[PDB]
Each structure stands twice: as structure tokens, then as C-alpha cells.
From a paper:
We previously synthesized an iodinated variant (7iGST) of eukaryotic glutathione S-transferase (GST), a homodimeric detoxification enzyme, in which seven specific residues of the 15 tyrosines per monomer were replaced by 3-iodo-l-tyrosines. The seven sites, specified with seven UAG codons in the gene, were distributed globally in the enzyme, including four on the surface (positions −1, 22, 141, and 163), two buried (positions 57 and 155), and one at the dimer interface (position 73). In the present study, two additional variants (7bGST and 7cGST), which contained 3-bromo- and 3-chlorotyrosines, respectively, in place of 3-iodotyrosine, were also synthesized in RFzero-iy, with these tyrosine derivatives being supplemented in the growth media. The structural study showed that the chlorination and bromination of the selected tyrosine residues achieved a more tightly packed protein interior, with the bulky atoms filling internal spaces and creating additional interresidue interactions.
The halogenation at position 32 significantly increased the heat resistance of 3bGST and 3cGST, whereas those at positions 27 and 56 each abolished the resistance. Finally, position 32 was halogenated and position 155 was made halogen-free in the initial variants 7bGST and 7cGST, to create 7bGST-1 and 7cGST-1, respectively. The heat resistance was drastically increased (0 to 71% for 7bGST-1, 11 to 79% for 7cGST-1), and was accompanied by significant recoveries of the specific activity (47 to 67% for 7bGST-1 and 60 to 72% for 7cGST-1). The ΔG(H2O) values for 7bGST-1 and 7cGST-1 (33.3 and 32.9 kcal/mol, respectively) were larger by 5.6 and 5.2 kcal/mol, respectively, than that of wtGST. The major stabilizing positions 32, 57, and 73 are located in domain I, which consists of a four-stranded β-sheet and three α-helices. The side chains of the halogenated tyrosines at positions 32 and 57 (Hal32 and Hal57) protrude from each side of the β-sheet, and are buried in the protein interior. The halogen moiety of Hal32 fills the space between the side chains of Lys39 and Lys43, while that of Hal57 fills the space between the side chains of Pro2, Leu4, Leu20, and Tyr27. The halogen moiety of Hal73 occupies the space at the dimer interface, between the side chains of Lys77 and Lys86, where Lys86 belongs to the other monomer. The halogen atoms are accommodated in spaces with sizes between 1.25 and 1.70 Å for wtGST, while the radii of the bromine and chlorine atoms are 1.85 and 1.75 Å, respectively.
Residue numbers in the entry:
A (entry chain A), B (entry chain A): -1 to 216
The structure:
């Protein structure tokens, strides 16, 4: 059975937590990566993939042809029996999910604004309230759902990576989160991935973004 | 066993699709509604509910204490065996979910901007691409996942309701969506709900929003 395909821009963006989950699980996959100058190339292929809701990212494995980043990461998790063993645990994991997205989408939704520098002040003013809930969550816990890794762990990791670019001191007040970020980096298969040529360091958002864009870090 | 509690602002906002699902399922529930002048009241209660990630909406039923609107609607769906019977169907439903949220969050993310009137032009320019995928999806289908209702049907319904306020003609080119909206309204338990005193007609977003705010429609 062939390697499934993960299609996306050559950026971190929406799919970075999925990459980390895949690498955590030591799953084989191949990426179809779209470059900065391949917009027309993508548009010419977008409607020729059998996708119900054509978009990036997409995931194709011979059983599914998916779009929506959260459907994709949840499918991979689900195929490894990680979404939760009953309605209460599935709800817990979806709740963790959404709370992470409040941070990650909080970034994405202002990153392309001409008025980023201003909107950034409001986001960073609210951010400690969001981080505090995760700091608390990690009291005497190894991962967000206890002693075992779940996909929101990699979502949170990505969110922390990204907000540190917006303000390198924003975790100084949250030592358990700083520790969590290091703990994820100390998973050997993640360590190996981050050191590999498959790791995409930059950009964070699309290249044209005001925050987290461009070909290289500022 | 007592009526579960759904807590939220007295607005449509993030929770309207959940209300519709509950009413579809003819489930008993009570809402704790926060009014426009009850911000301090909420802030004084927010951290005293046993919530891991305090926020609005919340859902409490004696088995769970949830936040995150999508965790909540998925829990209710899950308790009625509606999330999908296998990984492929669960992924399909999550994909529908996300594609709806691209429209609904597309609105929410610009609705509080001082620059709404400008951002609105871009959103409405892109909107037909998003609607087209649903128009296509509904070719010879009664609901988004075929012959039976799923929670993204009510998410889509809410999204259509809302974008019609932004532009009353935006569905003129999508007759299957206009029909879908009427078909949802023709579910007798939804018809009854929309005519009831429990229905909240306005606002769409928070009261202070530039779009979909205020005490009454413009
Ligand atoms: N809600 C969707 C949003 C997808 C999206 O906005 N993709 C952007 C890149 S971050 C894109 O370029 N899509 C390509 C297209 O619209 O054709 C998701 O989570 O996957
Ligand atoms: N991602 C969260 C966002 C929740 C959110 O932004 N809630 C707003 C109203 S739409 C609020 O007033 N929360 C109250 C608070 O932050 O204390 C969700 O889907 O539930």
C-alpha cells in the first residue's frame, strides 16, 4: 500500500501540527509541496483531484480524499485510535483542540492585515489569558490529556512556536509551557524530524503575510 | 436527570447551530443567557464553574463541563450517534464542518473591524467560490451527508442566515442552497423553534460588532 499524500504550500501554516503527528506516529507519507510561485499551478490542478471541497491542505490515501486541516489531523488521529475512547474523552480532546485554535487562528486572522502592528497589541494583550489556561492544564500532567500524547499536543506546540516569533518573551511567565515545548522537542522522533530536510522552518503563514511571511525570518 | 445547561450571550453567534441541533433532536435544555450589560456579571462567574478552559459558550450536564462551541455541538451529536460510524464518515463530517466554518468565521473575523466595509468587499468576492462547493454537494442530495441530517446541516443553515444579512442577494446564484435553507425551515421541530420565544433573532455577532451587532437589525 502506497505512501499517502499530504498536499500544501511549502509553509508551516495550517498543516504543521499534522506533519508532527505523522512523524510522532512514524507514518510514511509524501508531501506535494506548492511553492511561492506556484499559485497558478495549484489553481490549474485544484479541481482535478476528486476533492469535494477543493482546498489546501488535502490528504489522499486511497480510502479518503480530504480537505480541511482539522478533518485531516483528526482522520490520522482516528486511524490510530487517538480521538477518544468514549464521548466524554472525545469532547475533552475537541475542547483542547478549540482552545489551541483560539491562539493559532488568533495569529492567522491578523497576520495579513495592513494594520497588523496595531492588532498585534490587542492579541498579545489577550494572549496571557489563553496561555494561563494551558499552564494550569499542565499542572502535574505530562501532556495536555495526561500521560499519553494526543494530537492537540502538537497543535499547542505549533501555536507556541508561532507566538514566540510575535514576541520572544511571551512565554517567560509560563514556565510549564516552556517546559512542554522542550518536552515535545525531546520526543526522539520529533527531534529527528526537526533536524531533517523535511522540516519547514519558515514561513509561518503564507509568504505574502505581514507577520510570519517572506522567504526568510526577519 | 436534570436539564443540561447551555451558557452563552443572548446572541446567535457561535452557539446558534447547537441550539438548532438540540431542537432538531427534541432534547430538553436550559440556557443561561448573558445580556449586553452583563459582562462584569459573567467575568465574576467565569472561573467559578469548574471549567478547564473558561469561555462562552459552556455546556454542563453532569457528565461533562465543556467549553468550545465545536466541542459542544460535537458532544451533543456524539451522544446521539451522529458523528460518523467509522473513520471515513467521521472525516467526511469534519470536512463539511470546516468548510462551513470557512464561511461563518469568514464573517466573524471581519465583523468587529473598523474597516469592515472594505474587508466585506473581499469576503463577498470570495464567498461564491465557497457557496459553489455546497451547491455542488447538494446535487441530488437532501442534506449535506445524504438522506439524513447531520450537525453540519445546521451549521450551514446558520452561515446562510448570516451571509444573507451581509448581502441579501448573495444566494441568488445558488438555488439549491436557497432550497436547502427552506428545507431546514420545513423541519417541523425547527419551524416550531423559530416561531418560539426561545429563538434569538438578533444580534448575529456580539452587540458591539460593526456587522451584525446592535440591539436590532438595521
Ligand atoms: N479551513 C480551511 C482553510 C484552508 C485555507 O485557507 N487554505 C489556504 C492556505 S492557508 C489556501 O491557499 N487554499 C487554497 C485555495 O483556496 O485554493 C482549513 O483549515 O484547511
Ligand atoms: N473558539 C471559541 C471562542 C469563544 C469566544 O470567543 N467567546 C466569546 C463570545 S463569541 C466570549 O465572549 N467569551 C467569553 C470570555 O472570553 O470570557 C469557541 O468556539 O467557543
Amino acid at each position: 500500500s502506497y505512501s499517502p499524500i499530504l498536499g500544501y504550500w511549502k509553509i508551516k501554516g495550517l498543516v504543521q501540527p499534522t506533519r508532527l503527528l505523522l512523524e510522532y506516529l512514524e507514518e510514511k507519507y509524501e508531501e506535494h509541496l506548492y511553492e511561492r510561485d506556484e499559485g497558478d499551478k495549484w489553481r490549474n490542478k485544484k479541481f482535478e483531484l476528486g476533492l469535494e471541497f477543493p482546498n489546501l491542505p488535502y490528504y489522499i490515501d486511497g480510502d479518503v480524499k480530504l480537505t480541511q486541516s482539522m478533518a485531516i489531523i483528526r482522520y490520522i488521529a482516528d486511524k490510530h485510535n487517538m480521538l477518544g475512547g468514549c464521548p466524554k474523552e472525545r469532547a475533552e480532546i475537541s475542547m483542547l483542540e478549540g482552545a489551541v485554535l483560539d491562539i493559532r487562528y488568533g495569529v492567522s486572522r491578523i497576520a495579513y492585515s495592513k494594520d497588523f502592528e496595531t492588532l498585534k497589541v490587542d492579541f498579545l494583550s489577550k494572549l496571557p489569558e489563553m496561555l494561563k489556561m494551558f499552564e494550569d492544564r499542565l499542572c502535574h500532567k505530562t501532556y495536555l490529556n495526561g500521560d499519553h500524547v494526543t494530537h492537540p499536543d502538537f497543535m499547542l506546540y505549533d501555536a507556541l512556536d508561532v507566538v514566540l516569533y510575535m514576541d520572544p518573551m511571551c512565554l517567560d511567565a509560563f514556565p510549564k509551557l516552556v517546559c512542554f515545548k522542550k518536552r515535545i522537542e525531546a520526543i526522539p522522533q520529533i527531534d529527528k524530524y526537526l533536524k531533517s530536510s523535511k522540516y519547514i522552518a519558515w514561513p509561518l503563514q503564507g509568504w505574502q503575510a505581514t507577520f510570519g511571511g517572506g522567504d526568510h525570518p526577519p
